[PDB]
Amino acid sequence: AFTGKFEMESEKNYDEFMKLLGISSDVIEKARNFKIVTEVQQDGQDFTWSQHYSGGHTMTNKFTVGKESNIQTMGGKTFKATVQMEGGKLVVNFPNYHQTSEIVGDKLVEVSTIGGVTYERVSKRLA
Numbered sequence: 596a597f598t599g600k601f602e603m604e605s606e607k608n609y610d611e612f613m614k615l616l617g618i619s620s621d622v623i624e625k626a627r628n629f630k631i632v633t634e635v636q637q638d639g640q641d642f643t644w645s646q647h648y649s650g651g652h653t654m655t656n657k658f659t660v661g662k663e664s665n666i667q668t669m670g671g672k673t674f675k676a677t678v679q680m681e682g683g684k685l686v687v688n689f690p691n692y693h694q695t696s697e698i699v700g701d702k703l704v705e706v707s708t709i710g711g712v713t714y715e716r717v718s719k720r721l722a
């Protein structure tokens with residue numbers, strides 16, 4: 596149950612990480628300067644995050660954890676894989692991608708891998 600409103604303030608390897616994944620400039624220009632917000636909603640197996648960035652564009656995804664072909668990017672591009680829970684933390688696995696998504700303490704903490712190279716992110720809640 597990841598639900599809430601969270602503000603980000605940490606980006607590590609950000610400009611290279613988001614390019615490799617397939618952001619041209621759109622989300623990364625907004626993240627480096629303004630640092631992204633979100634509103635999350637989890638209904639057991641069913642999941643939704645909605646994110647918002649500087650000019651007040653929305654990007655959402657809605658998927659069922661352990662189900663496939665409903666999951667989409669910061670840009671909102673759809674993909675097919677199996678999102679998995681392990682210790683209550685959400686992960687996908689790909690040839691080119693991996694990541695893991697969790698709550699530590701009261702703070703929200705994410706650690707990600709593309710092409711074998713690492714990203715990590717940090718956020719504070721105010722729901």
Ligand SMILES: C[C@H](CCC(=O)NCC(=O)O)[C@H]1CC[C@H]2[C@@H]3[C@H](O)C[C@@H]4C[C@H](O)CC[C@]4(C)[C@H]3C[C@H](O)[C@]12C
Pocket residue numbers: 597601602603606609613622623626627631632633635644646669684685695696697698703704705716717718
């Ligand atoms: C507000 C931002 C948005 C990320 C973004 O779009 N950044 C562009 C960039 O990284 O440059 C992040 C910070 C940490 C994220 C959370 C962490 O992964 C932990 C936690 C993981 C859950 O599985 C789903 C909700 C969420 C709260 C995540 C939702 C949302 O994703 C958050 C709270």
Ligand SMILES: C[C@H](CCC(=O)NCC(=O)O)[C@H]1CC[C@H]2[C@@H]3[C@H](O)C[C@@H]4C[C@H](O)CC[C@]4(C)[C@H]3CC[C@]12C
Pocket residue numbers: 616617618644656658666667668669670671672678685686687694695696
């Ligand atoms: C940073 C990556 C990818 C960004 C990207 O590929 N952008 C391409 C584009 O913008 O064109 C983000 C975007 C959306 C994310 C997924 C969606 O938010 C849904 C899902 C949520 C769980 O916390 C973790 C797994 C999972 C499945 C997320 C894994 C990391 C993804 C795939």
